[PDB]
Amino acid sequence: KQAAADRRTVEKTWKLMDKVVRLCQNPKLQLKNSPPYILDILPDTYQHLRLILSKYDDNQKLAQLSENEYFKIYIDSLMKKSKRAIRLFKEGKERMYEEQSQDRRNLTKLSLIFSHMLAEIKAIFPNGQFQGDNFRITKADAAEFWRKFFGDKTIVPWKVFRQCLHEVHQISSGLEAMALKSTIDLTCNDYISVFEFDIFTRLFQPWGSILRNWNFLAVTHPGYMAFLTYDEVKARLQKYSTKPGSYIFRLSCTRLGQWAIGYVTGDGNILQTIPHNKPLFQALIDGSREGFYLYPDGRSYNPDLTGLCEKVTQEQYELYCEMGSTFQLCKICAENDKDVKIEPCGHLMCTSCLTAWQESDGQGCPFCRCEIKGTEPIIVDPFD
């Protein structure tokens, strides 16, 4: 539950965003101007929040805006991530100036969240006017799923989304569900907006086999690079410039819902292409037969993708989860946050799963099976 996103609350987020900008302006960080660039994103977020306030110019319009379900969640998430960025700089101390530290890695995670949130707020409020109830999901079969389970909702909790998705496309485990949350919930707010659903369904289309497409194209494919920048894609492929057909594919933080395939040409140049509103695996199979996409990340083995026209280990899901912000969520259910600590092993989970486990005569801790000497309520942050 969130409080009303009134003018006073919207302004509190501006002051927090301002603090983050000054922290990130420190030249000891040697911050790359490559996307997501927090120094462009936060002022652009402020300008969009002003554009929204200029459209709702009277007290009655402001009251309607303050009680908008999506707007309340958005302002609360914006406040939370800004406070989190301030805390990261405080606790990080000198580790913020170490490009390879976990504190800096967390800053990249926040920068990506702020980037995704800006694209989301511009899609839901184009020109500062709410259009969430009129948001058009690109894929019709995916739009019918959203309309069936969520009606005209602009945003739904992750918990409800995952349960309803499972009715159509089965999710085989807690780790898979955790990996799926980090892929769809781009803003890391424990909700799925109709815009995040549109991005995910555009990337892993067709809808009919979306989870097989996601598992084969992203979780386990050696060519998949997530939001690795164009410069890093070219520098990664530079090592294989003597192997024509070496290719990698990435997501674009400035072009959400689109893929960018970098590859080595016959003359050793590294070129890129953005496939149309077509399935990524189709472009990859087309490119394989034509001779452009043969070696995913220079690897001589190109996985056979032709099965998607008509398995993943727990370890594979665990590795995939590292780039995300899912540490705060119970690993057993992947729907409730961790709120309880076992003693003396220290394993964390939600109370509901611990109760289910104790009521099943499960011996000791569900993770390690050491005797549960006691429990303690806790609050976990994704960066612990």
Ligand X SMILES: C[C@@H](c1cnn(C)c1)n1cc(C(F)(F)F)cc(-c2cccc([C@]3(c4nncn4C)C[C@@H](C)C3)c2)c1=O
Under the binding rule (CB under 5 A), the answer on residue 353 touching Zn ion is: yes
Distance of alpha carbon 106 from alpha carbon 188, whole angstroms: 13
Partner whose binding site includes residue 68, from Na ion, ligand X, Zn ion, none (CB under 5 to 8 Å by kind): none
The binder of 228, among Zn ion, Na ion, ligand X, none, by C-beta within 5 to 8 A per type, is ligand X
- Cβ closest to ligand X, residue 155 vs residue 217: 217
* Residue (of 259, 196, 198, 191) closest to 226 by Cα position: 259
Among the listed residues 251, 205, 257, the one whose alpha carbon sits nearest the alpha carbon of residue 226: 251
- Given the structure tokens 């990859």, which residue do they identify? 284
H/E stretch holding 106: helix 102-124
User: Could you tell me where the beta strands, DSSP code E, fall in the chain?
Assistant: 155-157, 191-193, 246-251, 259-264, 270-273, 295-296, 340-343, 348-349, 374-377
33 is in an annotated binding site: no
Shortest distance (Å) from residue 188 CB to ligand X: 8
Report the nearest approach of Zn ion to the CB of residue 29 (Å). 37
The SS3 call for residue 296 is strand
Per-residue x/- marks for ligand X, 235-264, CB under 6 A? Answer: ----------------x-------------
Ramachandran quadrant class, 166 (left: phi over 0; alpha: psi -120 to 50; beta: rest): alpha
To Na ion, the closest distance from the beta carbon of 192 in angstroms equals 6
Please tell me whether residue 187 binds Na ion under the rule CB under 5 A: yes
> Taking contact as CB under 5 A, which single stretch among the options 81-89, 178-186, 210-218, 359-367 is the one that binds Na ion?
178-186
Interface with Na ion: number of residues (CB under 5 A)? 4
Residue 44's φ and ψ, nearest 5 degrees, are -65, -30
Q: How many residues does the chain have?
A: 384
Q: Determine whether the annotation assigns residue 343 to a binding site.
A: no
For residue 152 the two structure tokens come to: 């005209």
Distance CA 41, CA 240 (A): 34
**Residue 316 interface partner, choices Na ion, ligand X, Zn ion, none, CB cut-off 5-8 Å depending on type:** none
Binding residues for Ca(2+), by number, are 185, 187, 189, 191, 196
Residues that bind ligand X (CB under 6 A): 105, 108-109, 112, 182-183, 225-228, 251, 320, 323-324
Binding residues for 4-O-phospho-L-tyrosine, by number, are 250
Residues that bind Na ion (CB under 5 A): 185, 187, 189, 191
Residues that bind Zn ion (CB under 5 A): 330, 332-333, 336, 345, 347, 350, 353, 365, 367-368
Binding residues, by number, are 185, 187, 189, 191, 196, 250
